[PDB]
């Protein structure tokens, strides 16, 4: 059919899509918006030929490429801060300059994480240490990864932990709320202030966190590299634990792919970052309300680039990211 069914997951998203539909109705390939409840119902619908495309972040792209769905990324967002590359950010392990331990000596240290279940603060560092054999965890009937992590760090602040009391021990706040998901130490900046205040030896955050929170104090900090070195905060490209890819549009591997990309390439041409139209494919940025943010594509995206036909989800996400999330399941 020369109809692309975009899958949407909220009513403001569903609205943006019907506006792009009105705006492209007289093009030969047309748009039609399907709304489902969650992104997972959208993966099942694309898989079952009920819809054809949706933009997913990296963990959701992992999910969409596994059996039985087997969707692959076909185009990916580009952002200003990562300069032509299909990368959202790099996960790094920030330490104070002058401590001497390397990644070989992490056992028994205290740590700061953004929260339980988050990419840079929990899924990438802990799946990397499990994959490399530093943390032993064989699977959920063992129990939670919280127990395995508690035999590795001596105490931590992990916002959102519920199984192990040591995982909340380094957290700031009164007893009732120090380990809540919205604690004083949650998020990228929270896990950095945990490191700054000496409550942990390592903060698992992203490559921009020190520059955002402490621009004027970068050289008090270093990065812990997976090869044994410690490098400057600005050396994240050669000293990160994993690259977290850009959001990608996933689709069934079948020849409707050139049609989706043909639709997207004209849509971007007319309504991309430099459009004089009122409809913007990408944002613009500055929507304060979460329900109004990043509808269809990220508001910060500046274009979409076609993913080579031979990259599947593993190749798109990269080995470090992939083998770390694979270890968390
Ligand atoms: O990525 C996530 O899963 C959630 N975040 C926030 C975000 O990325 O905006 C923190 C983290 O990565 O620890
Ligand atoms: Fe994140």
Residue 201 sits in a domain whose CATH number is 3.40.190.10
What residues contact 7, with CB distance under 8 A and at least 6 apart? 33, 34, 35, 36, 42, 45, 46, 51, 52, 53, 54
CA angle 324, 99, 121 (to 5 degrees): 25
Same domain, 270 and 297: yes
Same domain, 8 and 155: no
- List pocket residues of ligand 1, CB cut-off 6 Å: 114, 118-121, 188
Same domain, 106 and 212: yes
Same domain, 151 and 240: yes
What residues contact 51, with CB distance under 8 A and at least 6 apart? 5, 6, 7, 34, 36, 42, 45
Same domain, 94 and 70: no
In terms of C-beta density within 10 A (0-12 exposed, 13-18 middle, 19 or more buried), how is residue 265 classed?
Answer: middle
Q: Domain for residue 329, yes or no? A: no
- Residue length, the chain? 329
Helices (H), the chain: 11-24, 39-47, 58-65, 124-131, 145-150, 187-196, 209-213, 257-271, 313-317, 319-327
Q: Judge contact between 279 and 38, C-beta under 8 A.
A: no
Same domain, 139 and 215: yes
Nearest one of 3, 1, 35, 2 to 17, comparing CA atoms: 35
Ligand 2 centroid–CA 93 distance in Å is: 14
Same domain, 288 and 319: no
Helices (H), 151-220: 187-196, 209-213
Method by which the coordinates were obtained: X-ray
Q: Name the DSSP class of 131.
A: H
Tokens 């694979």 belong to which residue?
A: 326
Residues in binding site: 57, 89, 114, 118, 120-121, 188, 247
Same domain, 257 and 238: no
Domain that holds residue 123: 79-247+314-324
Residue 33 and residue 47: Cα distance in Å, rounded?
16
Partners of 110 in beta bridges? 155
Same domain, 61 and 186: no
Resolution (A): 2.1
Ligand 2 centroid–CA 255 distance in Å is: 33
Same domain, 124 and 230: yes
Residue 257 and residue 161: Cα distance in Å, rounded?
41
Q: Whose CA is nearest to atom 1 of ligand 1?
A: 119
Give the number of the atom of ligand 1 that is nearest the alpha carbon of residue 114: 13
Residue 200 and residue 172: Cα distance in Å, rounded?
11
- Beta strand 30-35 with 3-8 is parallel
């Amino acid at each position: 059919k020369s109809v692309i069914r975009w899958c949407t997951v909220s009513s403001p998203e569903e609205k943006k899509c019907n506006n792009l539909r009105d705006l492209t109705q007289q093009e030969r390939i047309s748009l039609t918006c399907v709304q489902k409840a969650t992104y997972l119902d959208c993966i099942k619908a694309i898989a079952n030929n009920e819809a054809d495309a949706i933009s997913l972040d990296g963990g959701q792209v992992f999910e969409a490429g596994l059996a039985p769905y087997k969707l692959k990324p076909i185009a990916a967002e580009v952002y200003e801060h990562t300069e032509g590359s299909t990368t959202s950010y790099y996960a790094v392990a920030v330490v104070k300059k002058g401590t001497e331990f390397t990644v070989n000596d992490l056992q028994g240290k205290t740590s700061c994480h953004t929260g339980l279940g988050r990419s840079a603060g929990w899924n990438i560092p802990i799946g990397t240490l499990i994959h490399r054999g530093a943390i032993e965890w064989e699977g959920i009937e063992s129990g939670s990864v919280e127990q395995a992590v508690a035999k590795f760090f001596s105490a931590s602040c992990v916002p959102g932990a519920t199984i192990e009391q040591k995982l909340c021990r380094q957290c700031k706040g009164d007893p009732k709320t120090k380990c809540a998901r919205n604690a004083p130490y949650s998020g990228y900046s929270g896990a950095f202030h945990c490191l700054k205040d000496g409550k942990g030896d390592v903060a698992f955050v992203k490559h921009t966190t020190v520059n955002e929170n402490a621009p004027d104090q970068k050289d008090e900090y270093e990065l812990l590299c997976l090869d044994g070195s410690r490098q400057p905060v600005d050396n994240y490209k050669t000293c990160n634990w994993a690259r977290v890819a850009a959001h990608a549009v996933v689709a069934r591997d079948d020849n409707k792919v050139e049609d989706i990309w043909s639709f997207l390439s004209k849509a971007q041409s007319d309504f991309g970052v430099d459009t004089k139209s009122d409809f913007h494919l990408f944002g613009p940025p500055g929507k304060k309300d979460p329900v109004l943010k990043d509808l269809l594509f990220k508001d910060s995206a500046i274009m979409l680039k076609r993913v080579p036909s031979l990259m599947d989800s593993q190749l798109y996400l990269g080995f470090e990211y992939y083998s770390a999330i694979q270890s968390m399941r």
